[PDB]
């Protein structure tokens, strides 16, 4: 049987409010909970549905140079395979196969809505409507390392902005724009902010093209024998419309706006 580490973040893994009366897979729901079961149809095999310990995705300590997350899961074989919104980036590359990109996403703004701001330029010319990231992560780091001139200039007023506009979750960052009276704009991946758009009380808008353009890949080990079906699935669902299918069921379909 194969062991699938996941994270629960909506709309992609979360606990059926009944959870207790049920065992096995039959606990959860979601996204991802759906991608799963597809997956494991066209590659043949058995899982069961465990979630990541530390509830994380998976960076390495710049120290003690340890995994955490969900990537630490799989290169300390504790789990098979990792079916989750797993960005696709080059350090967990190195250490972790990615299938194919399942979704596609990237940084963007979020804003409560009737904020005046509709691009990330519009946010680099002024200071009335201060904005932020997750103070560590991919995010954070585009900004600080980007040659463009306008996030450039975003990222010196970011550096030095007080009160902070650094946020230590996502959530905190969402409700900061929710509470800020349209003096806070929320710098996320865009598809946490299309879904929070989709949710009560419908105050939240994405507005501008992406900053950038990353992908969700499906996770096994290096040498897993698991790899080259996972990669074929995810094309195949995609080519069938299932993909697109499954997104507009949790984002849309089920939303509240
Ligand atoms: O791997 C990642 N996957 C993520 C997925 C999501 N999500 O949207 O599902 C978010 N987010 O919530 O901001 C942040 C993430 N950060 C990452 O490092």
């Given at each position: 049987?194969?062991?699938?580490?996941?994270?629960?973040?909506?709309?992609?893994?979360?606990?059926?409010?009944?959870?207790?009366?049920?065992?096995?897979?039959?606990?959860?729901?979601?996204?991802?909970?759906?991608?799963?079961?597809?997956?494991?149809?066209?590659?043949?095999?058995?899982?069961?549905?465990?979630?990541?310990?530390?509830?994380?995705?998976?960076?390495?300590?710049?120290?003690?140079?340890?995994?955490?997350?969900?990537?630490?899961?799989?290169?300390?074989?504790?789990?098979?395979?990792?079916?989750?919104?797993?960005?696709?980036?080059?350090?967990?590359?190195?250490?972790?196969?990615?299938?194919?990109?399942?979704?596609?996403?990237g940084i963007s703004?979020?804003?409560?809505?009737?904020?005046?701001?509709?691009?990330?330029?519009?946010?680099?010319?002024?200071?009335?409507?201060?904005?932020?990231?997750?103070?560590?992560?991919?995010?954070?780091?585009?900004?600080?390392?980007?040659?463009?001139?306008?996030?450039?200039?975003?990222?010196?007023?970011?550096?030095?902005?007080?009160?902070?506009?650094?946020?230590?979750?996502?959530?905190?960052?969402?409700?900061?724009?929710?509470?800020?009276?349209?003096?806070?704009?929320?710098?996320?991946?865009s598809?946490?902010?299309?879904?929070?758009?989709?949710?009560?009380?419908?105050?939240?808008?994405?507005?501008?093209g992406n900053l950038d353009?990353?992908?969700?890949?499906?996770?096994?080990?290096?040498?897993?024998?698991?790899?080259?079906?996972?990669?074929?699935?995810?094309?195949?669902?995609?080519?069938?419309?299932?993909?697109?299918?499954?997104?507009?069921?949790?984002?849309?379909?089920?939303?509240?706006?």
């Amino acid at each position: 049987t194969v062991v699938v580490t996941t994270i629960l973040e909506s709309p992609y893994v979360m606990m059926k409010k009944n959870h207790e009366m049920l065992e096995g897979n039959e606990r959860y729901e979601g996204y991802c909970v759906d991608l799963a079961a597809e997956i494991a149809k066209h590659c043949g095999f058995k899982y069961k549905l465990t979630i990541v310990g530390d509830g994380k995705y998976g960076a390495r300590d710049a120290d003690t140079k340890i995994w955490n997350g969900m990537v630490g899961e799989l290169v300390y074989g504790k789990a098979d395979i990792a079916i989750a919104p797993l960005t696709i980036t080059y350090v967990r590359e190195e250490v972790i196969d990615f299938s194919k990109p399942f979704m596609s996403l990237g940084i963007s703004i979020m804003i409560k809505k009737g904020t005046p701001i509709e691009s990330a330029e519009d946010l680099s010319k002024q200071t009335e409507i201060a904005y932020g990231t997750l103070d560590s992560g991919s995010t954070k780091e585009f900004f600080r390392r980007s040659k463009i001139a306008v996030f450039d200039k975003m990222w010196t007023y970011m550096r030095s902005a007080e009160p902070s506009v650094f946020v230590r979750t996502t959530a905190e960052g969402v409700a900061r724009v929710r509470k800020s009276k349209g003096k806070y704009a929320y710098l996320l991946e865009s598809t946490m902010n299309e879904y929070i758009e989709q949710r009560k009380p419908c105050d939240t808008m994405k507005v501008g093209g992406n900053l950038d353009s990353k992908g969700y890949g499906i996770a096994t080990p290096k040498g897993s024998s698991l790899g080259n079906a996972v990669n074929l699935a995810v094309l195949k669902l995609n080519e069938q419309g299932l993909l697109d299918k499954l997104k507009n069921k949790w984002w849309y379909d089920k939303g509240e706006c």
